[PDB]
């Protein structure tokens, strides 16, 4: 009655039998902008079932000496499907999300993961090691795409903030003893009712192994982590030609 769950939205379905619970971000469900919050004067388009569906992004490799990965949202969905073709033509953009991270292991493996949602996760660099040069992160590190990016110093989250207080935001834990999936429903968090979908990334997903992996010689040595996410209540406004970046 609580261990098993099913997520049906659009034409996709995720069924899992070792789930913990479906967390709700800040007690608020994703919705459409009301007439008070709205700024634009054109009617916003809203594809119902053609964008509110799950997109399985990529398969990672949780090895023994892993550090962590991060994906910037909604940068990961600008080349996939009708959602990746609507955010290239349109200017304004508004959507919640629904993130579901699968990571499976046997009953002989041990380890934990921290699946976090950090709003406006601003990447900062090491300033040349000593802290003299005013360096800045490149474009292939700030918005990594659908392949993520490996964290170089995961204790400070590559942003100056410590990892031990990360659970004040949305967090679920993939502990390979009891559960195997972490599902988070994120509402739309921005100061503006709509936003551009090509430069501003709203929040960043963080998957960091807190407790390490361990197994004995004889089990299979590779444990994959897959991210699966679905936009919810997507809206677009303002047509133009197709520009990539």
């Amino acid at each position: 009655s609580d261990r098993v769950a099913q997520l049906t939205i659009g034409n996709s379905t995720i069924t899992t039998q070792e789930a913990a619970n479906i967390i709700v971000g800040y007690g608020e469900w994703p919705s459409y902008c009301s007439d008070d919050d709205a700024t634009a004067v054109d009617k916003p388009t809203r594809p119902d079932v053609s964008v509110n569906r799950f997109y399985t992004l990529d398969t990672k490799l949780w090895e023994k000496s892993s550090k962590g990965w991060y994906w910037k949202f909604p940068d990961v969905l600008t080349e996939t499907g009708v959602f990746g073709q609507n955010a290239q033509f349109h200017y304004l953009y508004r959507s919640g999300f629904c993130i579901h991270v699968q990571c499976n292991a046997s009953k002989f493996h041990q380890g934990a993961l921290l699946v976090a949602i950090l709003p406006e996760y601003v990447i900062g660099t090491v300033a040349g090691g000593t802290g003299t040069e005013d360096s800045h992160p490149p474009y292939k590190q700030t918005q990594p795409g659908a392949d993520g990016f490996e964290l170089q110093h995961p204790y400070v989250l590559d942003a100056g903030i410590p990892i031990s207080q990360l659970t004040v935001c949305h967090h679920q834990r993939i502990n390979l003893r009891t559960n195997n999936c972490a599902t988070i429903i994120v509402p739309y968090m921005n100061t503006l009712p709509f936003d551009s979908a090509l430069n501003h990334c709203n929040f960043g997903l963080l998957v960091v192994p807190i407790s390490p992996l361990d197994f004995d010689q004889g089990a299979t040595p590779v444990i994959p982590i897959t991210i699966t996410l679905a936009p919810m209540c997507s809206e677009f406004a303002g047509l133009r030609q197709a520009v990539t970046q």
Binding site: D2, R3, A20, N21, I23, G25
Partner: protein, 58 residues
Amino acid sequence: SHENSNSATEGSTINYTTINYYKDSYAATAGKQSLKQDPDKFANPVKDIFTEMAAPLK
């Protein structure tokens, strides 16, 4: 006091008691905030709410 209503609070559930000597309401004092908490937003943000008397995963 007949003045403008253009402070950075207007349209909220919190009712203030401030003093003001000008025509605009952003020059007023800080005043006494209402004491309304919400622990269920950051601490128990789950969909089905479980009782403390019962184990959640059965």
